[PDB]
Amino acid sequence: ARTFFVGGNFKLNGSKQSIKEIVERLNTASIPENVEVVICPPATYLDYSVSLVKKPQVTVGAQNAYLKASGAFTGENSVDQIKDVGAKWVILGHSERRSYFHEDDKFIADKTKFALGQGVGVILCIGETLEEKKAGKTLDVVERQLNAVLEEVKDWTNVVVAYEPVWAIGTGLAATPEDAQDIHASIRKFLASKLGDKAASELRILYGGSANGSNAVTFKDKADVDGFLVGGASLKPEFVDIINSRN
């Protein structure tokens, strides 16, 4: 049905030594063969990371890309390049990009369309702030964010959506399995109206925001929770626990 999907977002963390260690832990670990795991290291380590991977279920993605393959854009990363080195994914629209780097919805829509055109999968990030939450605006907010992508992307076969409440990112204040499931269901319902049911049925909608080796297990029966996008826990042994949480 929808394959369980776990993404590891290392953020700006790592060394060859630490990366080595993570990747090797993955190569060695016992994980169901019906899982899709993606680790996302700093661009500096995409190549290296791709080289250490000796597990079929493990694939590397980048943490961000520009909306052109090549050109006069000093300091950016290209989808063509992350792919050249072996990566298969790219996280677009992450919250950290959104607030700090002023990445607007349109911008992320242009980047998604692009990467997808170049044949890389996309982990598209969406989610509300404590303030949009409190104001009952969670769903408008996510529908705003997705609509901007939908205007551009017609084929979502290679998109994985990761709903991540802004207020749950790295705070340890995760959404409850219950709230997450309903939000996911609503998102999914929203999308079916736009992409058809076959497509929304096959789409993975991960939960992200303080997902750890402990609470992962409590989301195990939530039908519209298809996996996680893990920040802090991705760099800990406990990441393997996340992977097996439905095992």
Place this chain on the structure above:
Amino acid sequence: ARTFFVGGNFKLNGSKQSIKEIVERLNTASIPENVEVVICPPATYLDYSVSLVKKPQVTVGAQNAYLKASGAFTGENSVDQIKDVGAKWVILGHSERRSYFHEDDKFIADKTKFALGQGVGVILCIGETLEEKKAGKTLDVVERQLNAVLEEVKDWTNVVVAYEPVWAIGTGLAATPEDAQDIHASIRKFLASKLGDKAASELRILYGGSANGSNAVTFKDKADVDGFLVGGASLKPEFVDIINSRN
């Protein structure tokens, strides 16, 4: 004396193969002793670049870094990682970051201070637009940009300043060696007052903005032009021509 410094700004360009060819060429060609060459590839290729270089004159640098070494800054580059992988420089303040990515003088200052603090050299870009130039603000502008840095930074041992008129970047409209020579000396003056004589006298000030194999030579006898920061041409053979430009 000041050692001729040539910087190669790949911008969003390269493949392992195209980078292999560039580096192998640097490796092959007759280049001066006492030249200082820094090739700056996309972050995706830093490590590989560094493993290809065989030439002691050639260093690898990155195109951008954030102002903190580690953290929840999805998609950014760390000075610690570029270093880990063996690059020795970072380009900070490039007009492309200044314009497309809304990077302001402060951010750039903060970035310059951190980078140095972690012991990576900085290639600090400064420059005026067509407007500012036409209006005779060029010194104004660059003194501005430089002071923002001066205020956080004090020891410029490891800084190289790249004066790059915005109107010359990738347009094919290079400054005249006269103008350039003029502008560098003023800037040098200015820094001597703030950084003292010795400092200002050992600090390389580069010219960038359509510096190519054809005109690199026309700057040969300009005392205050210590080298170049090359964009388009760094991808080309004529790059080694720029390095050998000082007869």
